[PDB]
Scaffold this active site. Structure first.
Site, PDB file in Angstrom:
ATOM      1  N   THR A 157      -3.127   0.614  -6.773  1.00 60.19           N
ATOM      2  CA  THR A 157      -3.261   1.615  -5.717  1.00 60.19           C
ATOM      3  C   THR A 157      -2.047   1.704  -4.814  1.00 60.19           C
ATOM      4  O   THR A 157      -1.483   2.786  -4.627  1.00 60.19           O
ATOM      5  CB  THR A 157      -4.470   1.345  -4.811  1.00 60.19           C
ATOM      6  OG1 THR A 157      -5.514   1.354  -5.752  1.00 60.19           O
ATOM      7  CG2 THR A 157      -4.727   2.422  -3.806  1.00 60.19           C
ATOM      8  N   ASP A 259     -12.727   5.059  -7.432  1.00 62.36           N
ATOM      9  CA  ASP A 259     -12.307   3.711  -7.777  1.00 62.36           C
ATOM     10  C   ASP A 259     -13.359   2.640  -7.407  1.00 62.36           C
ATOM     11  O   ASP A 259     -13.615   1.752  -8.213  1.00 62.36           O
ATOM     12  CB  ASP A 259     -11.003   3.343  -7.086  1.00 62.36           C
ATOM     13  CG  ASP A 259     -10.452   1.977  -7.328  1.00 62.36           C
ATOM     14  OD1 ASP A 259      -9.683   1.829  -8.231  1.00 62.36           O
ATOM     15  OD2 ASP A 259     -10.724   1.112  -6.530  1.00 62.36           O
ATOM     16  N   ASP A 306      -4.243   8.425  -7.798  1.00 59.35           N
ATOM     17  CA  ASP A 306      -3.204   7.427  -7.855  1.00 59.35           C
ATOM     18  C   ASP A 306      -3.114   6.767  -9.238  1.00 59.35           C
ATOM     19  O   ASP A 306      -2.036   6.339  -9.638  1.00 59.35           O
ATOM     20  CB  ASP A 306      -3.422   6.396  -6.765  1.00 59.35           C
ATOM     21  CG  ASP A 306      -4.806   5.758  -6.754  1.00 59.35           C
ATOM     22  OD1 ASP A 306      -5.639   6.086  -7.585  1.00 59.35           O
ATOM     23  OD2 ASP A 306      -5.004   4.939  -5.904  1.00 59.35           O
ATOM     24  N   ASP A 678      23.268  -2.828 -19.215  1.00 56.28           N
ATOM     25  CA  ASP A 678      22.564  -3.014 -17.956  1.00 56.28           C
ATOM     26  C   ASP A 678      22.280  -4.498 -17.755  1.00 56.28           C
ATOM     27  O   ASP A 678      21.118  -4.927 -17.681  1.00 56.28           O
ATOM     28  CB  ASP A 678      21.289  -2.180 -17.873  1.00 56.28           C
ATOM     29  CG  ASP A 678      20.746  -2.085 -16.479  1.00 56.28           C
ATOM     30  OD1 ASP A 678      21.549  -2.362 -15.547  1.00 56.28           O
ATOM     31  OD2 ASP A 678      19.547  -1.743 -16.371  1.00 56.28           O
TER      32      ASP A 678
HETATM   33  O1  LIG Z   1      -7.298  -0.180   0.919  1.00 58.44           O
HETATM   34  C1  LIG Z   1      -6.493   0.633   0.381  1.00 58.44           C
HETATM   35  C2  LIG Z   1      -5.914   0.424  -0.949  1.00 58.44           C
HETATM   36  O2  LIG Z   1      -6.544  -0.813  -1.512  1.00 58.44           O
HETATM   37  C3  LIG Z   1      -5.961  -1.271  -2.693  1.00 58.44           C
HETATM   38  C4  LIG Z   1      -7.162  -2.059  -3.245  1.00 58.44           C
HETATM   39  C5  LIG Z   1      -7.699  -1.507  -4.534  1.00 58.44           C
HETATM   40  C6  LIG Z   1      -8.171  -2.236  -5.668  1.00 58.44           C
HETATM   41  N1  LIG Z   1      -8.531  -1.293  -6.662  1.00 58.44           N
HETATM   42  N2  LIG Z   1      -8.347  -0.082  -6.245  1.00 58.44           N
HETATM   43  N3  LIG Z   1      -7.832  -0.091  -4.925  1.00 58.44           N
HETATM   44  N4  LIG Z   1      -6.141   1.837   0.998  1.00 58.44           N
HETATM   45  C7  LIG Z   1      -6.699   2.153   2.328  1.00 58.44           C
HETATM   46  C8  LIG Z   1      -6.022   3.460   2.588  1.00 58.44           C
HETATM   47  C9  LIG Z   1      -6.154   4.290   3.670  1.00 58.44           C
HETATM   48  N5  LIG Z   1      -5.579   5.509   3.765  1.00 58.44           N
HETATM   49  C10 LIG Z   1      -4.804   5.861   2.670  1.00 58.44           C
HETATM   50  N6  LIG Z   1      -4.143   7.091   2.693  1.00 58.44           N
HETATM   51  C11 LIG Z   1      -3.284   7.535   1.636  1.00 58.44           C
HETATM   52  C12 LIG Z   1      -3.226   9.097   1.607  1.00 58.44           C
HETATM   53  C13 LIG Z   1      -1.916   9.313   0.959  1.00 58.44           C
HETATM   54  C14 LIG Z   1      -1.492  10.463   0.348  1.00 58.44           C
HETATM   55  C15 LIG Z   1      -0.167  10.462  -0.271  1.00 58.44           C
HETATM   56  C16 LIG Z   1       0.611   9.273  -0.200  1.00 58.44           C
HETATM   57  C17 LIG Z   1       0.103   8.162   0.441  1.00 58.44           C
HETATM   58  C18 LIG Z   1      -1.140   8.168   1.009  1.00 58.44           C
HETATM   59  C19 LIG Z   1      -1.847   7.006   1.666  1.00 58.44           C
HETATM   60  N7  LIG Z   1      -4.615   5.093   1.545  1.00 58.44           N
HETATM   61  C20 LIG Z   1      -5.235   3.905   1.552  1.00 58.44           C
HETATM   62  C21 LIG Z   1      -5.181   2.910   0.435  1.00 58.44           C
HETATM   63 CA   LIG Z   2      -6.181   2.949  -6.456  1.00 52.10          CA
HETATM   64 CA   LIG Z   3      23.318  -1.926 -14.249  1.00 53.53          CA
HETATM   65 ZN   LIG Z   4      -9.127  -0.126  -8.027  1.00 52.39          ZN
END
Ligand SMILES: O=C(COCCc1cnn[nH]1)N1Cc2cnc(NC3Cc4ccccc4C3)nc2C1
Ligand SMILES: [Ca+2]
Ligand SMILES: [Ca+2]
Ligand SMILES: [Zn+2]
Ligand SMILES: *[C@@H]1O[C@H](CO)[C@@H](O[C@@H]2O[C@H](CO)[C@@H](O[C@@H]3O[C@H](CO[C@H]4O[C@H](CO)[C@@H](O)[C@H](O[C@H]5O[C@H](CO)[C@@H](O)[C@H](O)[C@@H]5O[C@H]5O[C@H](CO)[C@@H](O)[C@H](O)[C@@H]5O)[C@@H]4O)[C@@H](O)[C@H](O[C@H]4O[C@H](CO)[C@@H](O)[C@H](O)[C@@H]4O[C@H]4O[C@H](CO)[C@@H](O)[C@H](O)[C@@H]4O)[C@@H]3O)[C@H](O)[C@H]2NC(C)=O)[C@H](O)[C@H]1NC(C)=O
Ligand SMILES: [K+]
Ligand code: NA
Length: 799
Positions: A157, A259, A306, A678
């Site tokens: 993620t 997810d 994602d 490389d």
């Molecule tokens: O806790 C996590 C992830 O945990 C990983 C654990 C896990 C295990 N298996 N699967 N997942 N979060 C909380 C959280 C809150 N807010 C956003 N907002 C996003 C919206 C957006 C749009 C475009 C680019 C970037 C972003 C950030 N993202 C996240 C991801």
């Molecule tokens: Ca994810």
């Molecule tokens: Ca190189």
């Molecule tokens: Zn996950």
């Protein structure tokens, strides 16, 4: 110091400076919100939907959302207000109508962008869940969509969200997994806890910072987990009602689903219908909300995931305790990938080489493969970061790797997971773009998520920070705001040498057993009379300062580096009708001085004789010579490249069997082959002072890899050398290794293992561009944007 108040500050956009208490969408995550944040900012009373009996109610400020006459002007109506209370249709029930121009309220300077991100949303959900996602299905059919979007590796993620935000590979942005050790910092990043909030982990420049620096205001992209989805949407729609000078132009919504449920039930568990329905409802809320605000034909919406989700169970776990005896002297980052390092930096006993060998082809159905990180497929771009451990395990889809069995039951539960190789079908995810700037009812080919930053910058009129996208490769998604790239300027012009040296001036230790009508004929060939056949898309441009010579021949053309003593590139075309022949017995060890190139800028055969580990091969294959006489050209010293015997098994099979196979399948192919250096595994062409290995006793540098770019007509009724339209390409970057330990079946005939190796090391033309400083396809009949799309294509070989 949480004794201040959120009165008038709910979901404020500038996070204020401790020890002042916070009211922003992240305050919960820092245990830092003002005492009254829940009461004022997370109101729930009466839920999220207007009902007929609330219509025109007296405003009660306790309510979660409003159905009073004044709500549109305050910007806090429930999203279904106009439907319930004013006989309007839900957005999803309206016919799709082309949005040719932005239809925005007065005072909007530009169409806002809303990114609707969904965690674990596997690409095949768009078809398999279509009956239960009407809002999503309308976005998809009416807007611009891809059949899937390729994530980055590892398909976890935070790496993928931060790639979406920056346009960078994880090795460059620094978020290389969901957990990490940085030895410089001596600090650890984990999912639970507080180190992950320290800004030192997060490199590059994410979109919200790009926007802010260029005068475009941004909504905060991260949401605390306990903020319900309905409140996230209402908060976005409230921000969209701010005054012109205060209103952001870019926003993000995030959903933890599907997810969260996918991990528990597997990608297609019967429990997965409900999460998909709920996400669809959330899209419905946003779109009805936008329609109420008269923004539904103004805002560009991106619906993007994602990564996907695979079937993974506790029983499909490989244990390092079954391989290693020393299991307590290692630390493993486990699961759908493996990363190994020493438990103690004070143990000078720890040996990477012996761990790799103990993990290599040890059990017949082994479900992971160990790699030194520099030996991973270059398409993963997963090596140039100190946070990536030297030892990597690539885990087969549907499996896990763990150190010891007790790690798995003292922590069955889960039925889904993700993180595998980003080419795996189950890891692919989704892209839809809908709005005035996207095309109408348009399908586009699958593309990589590293490209989206540039397009999001194009959508907002921003200049992107330097990134790993290829700006212009996604112009075909857009109605307007396209980015009109120019081809890079050639930095070094070639020399065109004629015959300048007599045979006896060469003392290279080489030997070879070697009319008037057609004396003229072969002079014409040496001058470039067949070059139109063999160089179909122009000479590649050399984008750095160097000294090189173009060499023409009957069957191939090359760009020969006087600095590296070998071709940078060798170009040849093999028609469908071409015949394969053998290397005649009298020519087995034949190497011939090239009288166009000085002895001092030539390789020599004695070095290869003295170097007991290193042999040589040829870039233009002798097997595909057009005639016995043209074959002599293939044995020129200027066509020779250093090759380990183990690698020559791979190379020889490619050149003897596979090229002609491809020409017969694709109706001719054009092949460009060459070396790559490389040694610092940064994905970029080495300068010569970076080379770590030479053919013993010489200045002949040893490549780390060999590439080939194989191009034909996309309409395979036309031959490669008379193609009127779009092209089709496949490419590879093969590791130049002294063993075939990577291939567990290498003792077998090449027909059983070589092609599977080549498939694993499939590449984009752009990958090869970075690694060589060359720019390909400079002279075609195609638009430059189309060529950029072609250069980003990856042939994945999934079913
Ligand atoms: O806790 C996590 C992830 O945990 C990983 C654990 C896990 C295990 N298996 N699967 N997942 N979060 C909380 C959280 C809150 N807010 C956003 N907002 C996003 C919206 C957006 C749009 C475009 C680019 C970037 C972003 C950030 N993202 C996240 C991801
Ligand atoms: Ca994810
Ligand atoms: Ca190189
Ligand atoms: Zn996950
Ligand atoms: C994908 O796209 C990205 C982005 O375009 C490409 O990465 C860029 O590549 C360039 C070349 O490798 C690189 O430019 C160098 O940067 C140095 C300045 O670096 C800082 O400033 C920038 C600008 O704001 C910043 O982004 C950097 O961020 C990196 O580092 C921080 C840690 O501070 C991380 O938070 C962040 O995640 C990022 O890390 C990544 O990149 C670094 C390298 O910078 C890696 O080490 C990490 O593993 C990780 O991948 C920096 O904060 C600049 O100092 C360099 O100039 C030196 O180098 C050359 C010689 O090679 C020479 O011409 C100069 O004179 C100078 O030499 C002197 O220093 C040498 C090295 O220390 C020394 O040995 C000599 O003897 C001399 O004293 C150089 O210009 C650029 O930083 C990165 N950017 C990013 C964001 O990664 C990437 O190549 C693309 N990938 C592909 C495959 O195409
Ligand atoms: K040798
Ligand atoms: Na092997």
């Amino acid at each position: 110091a949480t004794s201040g108040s959120c009165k008038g500050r709910c979901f404020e956009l500038q996070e204020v400076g401790p020890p002042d208490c916070r009211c922003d969408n992240l305050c919960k995550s820092y245990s830092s919100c003002c005492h009254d944040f829940d009461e004022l900012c997370l109101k729930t009373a009466r839920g999220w939907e207007c009902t007929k009996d609330r219509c025109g109610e007296v405003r009660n400020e306790e309510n979660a959302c409003h159905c009073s006459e004044d709500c549109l002007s305050r910007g806090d109506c429930c999203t279904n207000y106009q439907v319930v209370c004013k006989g309007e249709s839900h957005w999803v029930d309206d016919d799709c109508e082309e949005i040719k121009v932005p239809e925005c309220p007065a005072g909007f300077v530009r169409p806002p962008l809303i990114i609707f991100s969904v965690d674990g949303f596997r690409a095949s959900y768009m078809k398999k869940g279509s009956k239960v996602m009407p809002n999503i299905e309308k976005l998809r059919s009416c807007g611009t969509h891809a059949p899937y979007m390729r994530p980055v590796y590892p398909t976890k993620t935070f790496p993928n969200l931060y790639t979406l935000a920056t346009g960078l590979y994880p090795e460059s942005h620094g978020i290389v997994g969901n957990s990490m050790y940085d030895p410089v910092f001596d600090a650890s990043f984990h999912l639970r806890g507080r180190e992950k909030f320290n800004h030192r982990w997060w490199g590059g420049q994410p979109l919200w910072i790009t926007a802010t620096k260029q005068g475009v205001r941004a909504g905060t992209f991260f949401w605390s987990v306990s903020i319900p989805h309905e409140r996230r949407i209402l908060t976005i729609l409230q921000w969209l009602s701010l005054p012109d000078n205060e209103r952001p132009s870019v926003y993000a919504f995030y959903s933890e689903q599907p997810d969260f449920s996918g991990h528990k039930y597997g990608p297609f568990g019967p429990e997965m219908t409900n999460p998909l329905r709920e996400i669809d409802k959330t899209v419905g809320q946003l779109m009805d909300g936008l329609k109420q605000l008269r923004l539904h034909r103004c805002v560009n919406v991106i619906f993007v995931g994602d990564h996907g989700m695979e079937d993974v169970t506790c029983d499909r776990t490989e244990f390092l305790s079954n391989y290693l005896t020393n299991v307590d002297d290692i630390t493993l980052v486990p699961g759908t990938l493996g990363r190994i390092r020493a438990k103690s930096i004070n143990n000078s006993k720890y040996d990477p080489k012996t761990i790799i060998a103990a993990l290599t082809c040890k059990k017949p159905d082994q479900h992971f493969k160990p790699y030194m990180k520099q030996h991973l497929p270059k398409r993963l771009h997963y090596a140039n970061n100190r946070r990536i451990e030297d030892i990597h395990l690539l885990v087969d889809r549907r499996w896990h790797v763990a150190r010891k069995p007790l790690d798995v039951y003292k922590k069955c539960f889960f039925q889904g997971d993700h993180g595998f190789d980003n080419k795996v079908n189950s890891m692919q995810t989704v892209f839809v773009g809908y709005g005035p700037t996207f095309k109408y009812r348009t399908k586009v080919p699958p593309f990589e998520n590293i490209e989206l930053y540039n397009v999001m910058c194009d959508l907002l009129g921003l200049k992107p920070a330097p990134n790993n996208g290829t700006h212009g490769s996604l112009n075909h998604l857009l109605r307007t705001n396209t980015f009109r790239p120019t081809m890079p300027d050639e930095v070094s012009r070639p020399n065109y040498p004629g015959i300048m040296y007599l045979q006896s001036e060469f003392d290279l230790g080489c030997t070879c057993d070697d009319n008037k009508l057609e004396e003229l004929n072969k002079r014409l060939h040496t001058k470039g009379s067949t070059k139109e056949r063999h160089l179909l898309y122009g000479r590649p441009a050399v984008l750095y300062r160097t000294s090189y010579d173009i060499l023409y021949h009957t069957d191939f053309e090359s760009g020969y580096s006087e600095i590296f003593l070998m071709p940078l590139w060798t170009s040849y075309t093999i028609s469908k009708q071409a015949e394969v022949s053998s290397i005649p017995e009298h020519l087995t060890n034949c190497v011939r001085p090239d009288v166009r190139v000085s002895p001092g800028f030539s390789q020599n055969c004695l070095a290869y004789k003295n170097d007991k580990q290193m042999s040589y091969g040829f870039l233009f294959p002798p097997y595909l010579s057009s005639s016995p006489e043209a074959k002599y050209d293939a044995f020129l010293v200027t066509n020779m490249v250093p090759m380990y015997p183990a690698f020559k098994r791979v190379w020889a099979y490619f050149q003897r069997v596979l090229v002609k196979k491809y020409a017969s399948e694709r109706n001719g192919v054009n092949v460009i082959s060459g070396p790559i250096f490389d040694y610092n595994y940064d994905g970029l062409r080495d300068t010569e002072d970076e080379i770590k290995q030479y053919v013993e006793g010489s200045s002949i540098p040893v490549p780390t890899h060999y590439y080939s770019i194989i191009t034909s007509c996309l309409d395979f009724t036309q031959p490669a050398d008379k193609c009127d339209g779009p092209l089709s390409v496949s490419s590879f970057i093969l590791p130049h290794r002294p063993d075939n330990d990577e291939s567990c079946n290498s003792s077998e005939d090449e027909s059983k293992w070589v092609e599977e190796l080549m498939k694993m090391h499939t590449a984009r033309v752009r990958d090869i561009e970075h690694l060589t400083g060359l720019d390909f396809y400079r002279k075609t009949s195609r638009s430059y944007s189309e060529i950029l799309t072609l250069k980003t294509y990856l042939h994945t070989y999934e079913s």
